[PDB]
Paper text:
In the bloodstream an unusually tight interaction between the bacteria and the brain microvasculature endothelial cells is established, leading to cortical plaque formation that results in opening of the blood brain barrier and bacterial invasion of the brain. This interaction is mediated by Type IV pili (T4P), long thin polymers of pilin proteins that interact with two endothelial cell receptors, CD147 and the β2 adrenergic receptor (β2AR). The interaction with CD147 is responsible for bacterial adhesion and the interaction with the β2AR induces signalling in endothelial cells. N. meningitidis PilE (Nm PilE) is 78% identical to Ng PilE and 100% identical in α1.
The Iterative Helical Real Space Reconstruction (IHRSR)41 approach was used to obtain the reconstruction, which after sorting converged to a rise of 10.3 Å and a rotation of 100.8° for the subset of segments used. The cryoEM map, with an estimated resolution of ∼6 Å, shows well-defined density for the PilE globular domain, with a central depression and a protruding ridge on one side. This density shows that the α1N segments are staggered in a helical array in the filament core and partially tilted relative to the filament axis, with their N termini close to the centre of the filament and their C termini lying at a larger radius. Thus, we built a model for the Nm T4P by separately fitting the Nm ΔN-PilE structure (residues 29–161) and α1N from the full-length Ng PilE structure, separated into two segments, α1:1–14 and α1:24–28, into the cryoEM map. These α-helical segments were then joined by an extended non-helical segment, α1:15–23. The ridge of density located on one side of the globular domain is occupied by the hypervariable segment of the D-region, the β-hairpin loop, β6 and the loop following β6, with Lys140 prominently displayed at its most protruding point. In our Nm T4P model the α1 segment 24–53 is curved but runs roughly parallel to the filament axis while α1:1-14 is tilted with its N terminus oriented toward the centre of the filament. This orientation places the side chain of Glu5 in close proximity (<5 Å) to the N-terminal amine of Phe1 (Phe1:N) on the neighbouring α1 in the 1-start helix, consistent with a salt bridge, which matches perfectly the well-defined channel connecting the rod-like densities at their termini. The new Nm T4P model with its non-helical α1 segment provides a molecular basis with which to understand the reversible force-dependent polymorphism observed for both Nm and Ng T4P2932.
Residue numbers in the entry:
A (entry chain C), B (entry chain B), D (entry chain A): 1 to 161
C (entry chain E): 55 to 161
The structure:
Amino acid sequence: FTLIELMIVIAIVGILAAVALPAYQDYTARAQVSEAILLAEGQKSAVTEYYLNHGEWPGDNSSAGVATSADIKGKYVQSVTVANGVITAQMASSNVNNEIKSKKLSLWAKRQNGSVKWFCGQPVTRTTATATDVAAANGKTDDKINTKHLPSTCRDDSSAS
Amino acid sequence: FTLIELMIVIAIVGILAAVALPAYQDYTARAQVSEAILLAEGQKSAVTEYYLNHGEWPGDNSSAGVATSADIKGKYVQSVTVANGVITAQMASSNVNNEIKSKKLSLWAKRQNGSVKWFCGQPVTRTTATATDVAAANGKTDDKINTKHLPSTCRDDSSAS
Amino acid sequence: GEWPGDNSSAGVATSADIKGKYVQSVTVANGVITAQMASSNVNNEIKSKKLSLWAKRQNGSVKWFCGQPVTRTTATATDVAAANGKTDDKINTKHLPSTCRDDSSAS
Amino acid sequence: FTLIELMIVIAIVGILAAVALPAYQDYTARAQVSEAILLAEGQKSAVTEYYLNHGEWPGDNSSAGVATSADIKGKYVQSVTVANGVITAQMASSNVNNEIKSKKLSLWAKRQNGSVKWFCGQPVTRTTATATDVAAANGKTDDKINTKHLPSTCRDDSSAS
């Protein structure tokens, strides 16, 4: 009945190759998400510049005069969009974490002691291109990204100022 | 007693998920610190200009006529200050490396073959707005930042000339 | 262009700095870094043992080496010296895995 | 023999912390180099002015009447020199990329449809202060800087006209 001991070793192996893997489709997502974060970053400039020139954020890419929603893109990026200076990009719809598939988070800068502070966080939009305060246009959170599937920092709401 | 071998694999896992992570609260700090570095940089201009116009550094932001201590700020920046042309900003007091929480380092330019050379390094202050030589006003090193928690370069003392 | 003679040359966590389980020292030697086994709850054998970490400059930048406690001739240099500590801290290549079997000579 | 799998993970870590870092002593150099580029720029004016006034470049700083070789300097700059209007500065001899340690590249403007075009590139010198064409005085390329360790643009030879 070392066989048991064997079948034990079998048994413990039996229930050892199942459900012993947390959150990795969760984890890949973050980077897979974060890949999307990497792109619209540059848009912030003319967005600022537009705000810099004018004092008002650009209502969008085109207000800024820059690459629109369906513009600048690639892997994990099926849109890149500005909203009254609030910039946003979307996850791809495949080869992703099945979860984060096609998700976004906005990028909104509200004026500081310094110039302004952006925010890597939830899909939101600025009340006006003129304003700095932005609105949590949540898109029923689909594009919104799990703060879990987000890293610790990039967990911002429109409220972020 | 493959169970041992198992419990070994357990055991080696046992003492594998503890203390195997150096210095990352240390590392984040650097950037979290370095974020603070990013801001007072612009102040150097009028500071120079003040020194440029006058031949004397500005005793501070206000001597220069520029954004004071509690002026220009944001994340990881709970002050930004000039001291006889020596400029300094402080770490935030939260969401930081618990270590570097609320820390500074000065920025002091002393006149060159060229114009002058600044220094990213420890909270210090210039002897006079007129001078270039600066004093290692150390604030008991709290605001002073760990050269470890600093990157290799930004390791300057008032002595830096 | 020179390695740090140690943690402090680098300005970083010294020998008795960064540590925990199975780590009773962590030390740099002219850019050659080393840590020691604990002195208990270990393999009674490997109890209190080390192996250095030395990078010598490449076609690429440089290549480190997980292997025996050694030290770099100079902080300036890349070549490192097999400061062997009478092999106590040195670790059995058997009690080491196949890869982490490097001597100062490793370049 | 998950131990193997372990020692594998060890092994792959074994040969993972060695030689997996290209060209960064190469990269720092560029900026460390480029720092040196930043300085002699202003010399171009009186150099031009000398050429502007006269029609001839200044044989040097002193011909122009400006800050000589061992003049204007600082970090990564252990000389700044003009050569018949061709200006040049040298890398420091420490705290640098051990490679680029003490290296130069000239700065030579040759007359255009417009006025003239300078060139950020290899240590060279102008045939005459009167001329525009410059000579690839190469100093056995030590001061000359690796086009790799240079950025893409600043890759000019005396021939650059």
